[PDB]
Design a protein around this motif. Structure first.
Motif, PDB file in Angstrom:
ATOM      1  N   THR A  12      -5.026  -2.221  14.621  1.00 26.08           N
ATOM      2  CA  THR A  12      -5.518  -3.402  13.925  1.00 26.08           C
ATOM      3  C   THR A  12      -6.904  -3.153  13.342  1.00 26.08           C
ATOM      4  O   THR A  12      -7.803  -2.666  14.029  1.00 26.08           O
ATOM      5  N   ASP A  13      -7.066  -3.493  12.070  1.00 23.41           N
ATOM      6  CA  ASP A  13      -8.337  -3.312  11.382  1.00 23.41           C
ATOM      7  C   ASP A  13      -8.468  -4.324  10.243  1.00 23.41           C
ATOM      8  O   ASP A  13      -7.930  -5.428  10.326  1.00 23.41           O
ATOM      9  N   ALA A  14      -9.175  -3.949   9.179  1.00 21.73           N
ATOM     10  CA  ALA A  14      -9.353  -4.840   8.039  1.00 21.73           C
ATOM     11  C   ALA A  14      -8.176  -4.746   7.070  1.00 21.73           C
ATOM     12  O   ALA A  14      -8.207  -5.327   5.985  1.00 21.73           O
ATOM     13  N   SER A  15      -7.134  -4.023   7.472  1.00 21.89           N
ATOM     14  CA  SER A  15      -5.945  -3.869   6.644  1.00 21.89           C
ATOM     15  C   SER A  15      -4.813  -4.735   7.183  1.00 21.89           C
ATOM     16  O   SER A  15      -3.904  -5.118   6.446  1.00 21.89           O
ATOM     17  N   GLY A  16      -4.880  -5.046   8.475  1.00 21.10           N
ATOM     18  CA  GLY A  16      -3.864  -5.870   9.096  1.00 21.10           C
ATOM     19  C   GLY A  16      -3.351  -5.280  10.396  1.00 21.10           C
ATOM     20  O   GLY A  16      -3.935  -4.338  10.931  1.00 21.10           O
ATOM     21  N   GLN A  17      -2.258  -5.839  10.904  1.00 27.91           N
ATOM     22  CA  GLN A  17      -1.664  -5.369  12.150  1.00 27.91           C
ATOM     23  C   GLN A  17      -0.582  -4.327  11.884  1.00 27.91           C
ATOM     24  O   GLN A  17       0.280  -4.519  11.026  1.00 27.91           O
ATOM     25  N   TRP A  18      -0.628  -3.226  12.629  1.00 25.32           N
ATOM     26  CA  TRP A  18       0.352  -2.156  12.475  1.00 25.32           C
ATOM     27  C   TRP A  18       0.944  -1.768  13.825  1.00 25.32           C
ATOM     28  O   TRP A  18       0.300  -1.924  14.864  1.00 25.32           O
ATOM     29  N   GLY A  19       2.170  -1.260  13.804  1.00 24.06           N
ATOM     30  CA  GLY A  19       2.827  -0.856  15.032  1.00 24.06           C
ATOM     31  C   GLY A  19       4.043   0.012  14.777  1.00 24.06           C
ATOM     32  O   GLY A  19       4.632  -0.036  13.696  1.00 24.06           O
ATOM     33  N   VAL A  20       4.422   0.806  15.773  1.00 21.34           N
ATOM     34  CA  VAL A  20       5.578   1.685  15.647  1.00 21.34           C
ATOM     35  C   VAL A  20       6.832   1.029  16.209  1.00 21.34           C
ATOM     36  O   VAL A  20       6.961   0.847  17.420  1.00 21.34           O
ATOM     37  N   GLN A  21       7.761   0.692  15.325  1.00 21.95           N
ATOM     38  CA  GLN A  21       9.013   0.079  15.737  1.00 21.95           C
ATOM     39  C   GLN A  21      10.183   0.994  15.404  1.00 21.95           C
ATOM     40  O   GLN A  21      10.241   1.570  14.318  1.00 21.95           O
ATOM     41  N   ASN A  22      11.106   1.133  16.350  1.00 17.60           N
ATOM     42  CA  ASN A  22      12.276   1.986  16.170  1.00 17.60           C
ATOM     43  C   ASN A  22      11.876   3.380  15.686  1.00 17.60           C
ATOM     44  O   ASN A  22      12.646   4.056  15.003  1.00 17.60           O
ATOM     45  N   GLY A  23      10.670   3.805  16.053  1.00 20.04           N
ATOM     46  CA  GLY A  23      10.189   5.116  15.656  1.00 20.04           C
ATOM     47  C   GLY A  23       9.823   5.188  14.187  1.00 20.04           C
ATOM     48  O   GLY A  23      10.161   6.157  13.506  1.00 20.04           O
ATOM     49  N   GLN A  24       9.129   4.167  13.697  1.00 15.80           N
ATOM     50  CA  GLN A  24       8.718   4.127  12.297  1.00 15.80           C
ATOM     51  C   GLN A  24       7.505   3.222  12.105  1.00 15.80           C
ATOM     52  O   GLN A  24       7.471   2.099  12.608  1.00 15.80           O
ATOM     53  N   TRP A  25       6.514   3.716  11.368  1.00 12.55           N
ATOM     54  CA  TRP A  25       5.302   2.947  11.103  1.00 12.55           C
ATOM     55  C   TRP A  25       5.612   1.758  10.201  1.00 12.55           C
ATOM     56  O   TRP A  25       6.375   1.879   9.243  1.00 12.55           O
ATOM     57  N   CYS A  26       5.013   0.614  10.505  1.00 17.27           N
ATOM     58  CA  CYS A  26       5.229  -0.587   9.707  1.00 17.27           C
ATOM     59  C   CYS A  26       4.325  -1.725  10.165  1.00 17.27           C
ATOM     60  O   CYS A  26       4.105  -1.917  11.361  1.00 17.27           O
ATOM     61  N   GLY A  27       3.809  -2.482   9.202  1.00 22.41           N
ATOM     62  CA  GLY A  27       2.940  -3.598   9.520  1.00 22.41           C
ATOM     63  C   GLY A  27       3.692  -4.744  10.164  1.00 22.41           C
ATOM     64  O   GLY A  27       4.916  -4.825  10.061  1.00 22.41           O
ATOM     65  N   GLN A  75       0.828  -1.200   0.000  1.00 17.29           N
ATOM     66  CA  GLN A  75       0.000   0.000   0.000  1.00 17.29           C
ATOM     67  C   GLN A  75       0.867   1.257   0.000  1.00 17.29           C
ATOM     68  O   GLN A  75       0.463   2.298  -0.517  1.00 17.29           O
ATOM     69  N   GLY A  76       2.059   1.151   0.581  1.00 21.97           N
ATOM     70  CA  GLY A  76       2.958   2.289   0.631  1.00 21.97           C
ATOM     71  C   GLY A  76       3.765   2.347   1.916  1.00 21.97           C
ATOM     72  O   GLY A  76       4.834   2.955   1.957  1.00 21.97           O
ATOM     73  N   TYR A  77       3.252   1.717   2.969  1.00 25.70           N
ATOM     74  CA  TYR A  77       3.935   1.705   4.258  1.00 25.70           C
ATOM     75  C   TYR A  77       5.266   0.963   4.160  1.00 25.70           C
ATOM     76  O   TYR A  77       5.706   0.599   3.070  1.00 25.70           O
ATOM     77  N   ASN A  78       5.906   0.745   5.305  1.00 23.72           N
ATOM     78  CA  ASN A  78       7.186   0.047   5.346  1.00 23.72           C
ATOM     79  C   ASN A  78       7.107  -1.170   6.262  1.00 23.72           C
ATOM     80  O   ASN A  78       6.198  -1.282   7.083  1.00 23.72           O
ATOM     81  N   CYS A  79       8.062  -2.084   6.113  1.00 26.54           N
ATOM     82  CA  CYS A  79       8.096  -3.291   6.928  1.00 26.54           C
ATOM     83  C   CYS A  79       8.691  -3.008   8.302  1.00 26.54           C
ATOM     84  O   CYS A  79       9.602  -2.191   8.439  1.00 26.54           O
ATOM     85  N   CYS A  80       8.173  -3.693   9.316  1.00 30.51           N
ATOM     86  CA  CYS A  80       8.655  -3.520  10.679  1.00 30.51           C
ATOM     87  C   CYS A  80       9.608  -4.644  11.056  1.00 30.51           C
ATOM     88  O   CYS A  80       9.186  -5.780  11.277  1.00 30.51           O
ATOM     89  N   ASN A  81      10.889  -4.325  11.138  1.00 34.38           N
ATOM     90  CA  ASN A  81      11.897  -5.308  11.500  1.00 34.38           C
ATOM     91  C   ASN A  81      11.490  -6.051  12.773  1.00 34.38           C
ATOM     92  O   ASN A  81      10.767  -5.510  13.609  1.00 34.38           O
TER      93      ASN A  81
END
Length: 100
Positions: free
Chosen positions: A25-40, A9-15
């Motif tokens: 969490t919604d109908a798009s999937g799980q998201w969270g802020v890791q190392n100060g960066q948005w990523c699923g 979609q455009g976001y980035n991966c969360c290491n």
């Protein structure tokens, strides 16, 4: 180490998705802020088969067998020891990055 469904979609991966805090969490999937960066949170976004983690770590225990009798929206899955476990991160691809 780059195959998150969020990037589609455009976001980035969360290491280290296997240890990321999903405050969303919604109908798009799980998201969270890791190392100060948005990523699923993609436990199977193309990691190594060294066995750093396993599937089904979000509910049931690990299986340890590379026989995924069934695959879901969270990866592959198997049934061993009389319990619905998830296929190990090692039981996905032998040539994990290392190309002979």
């Amino acid at each position: 180490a780059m195959a998150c469904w969020a990037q589609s979609q455009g976001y980035n991966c969360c290491n280290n998705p296997s240890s990321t805090k999903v405050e969303y969490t919604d109908a798009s999937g799980q998201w969270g802020v890791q190392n100060g960066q948005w990523c699923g949170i993609d436990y199977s976004y193309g990691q190594n088969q060294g066995n750093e983690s396993c599937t089904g770590n979000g509910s049931y225990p690990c299986c340890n067998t590379c026989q995924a009798t069934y695959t879901d929206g969270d990866g592959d899955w198997a049934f061993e020891n009389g319990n619905w476990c998830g296929i190990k991160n090692s039981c996905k691809q032998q040539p994990q990055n290392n190309n002979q």
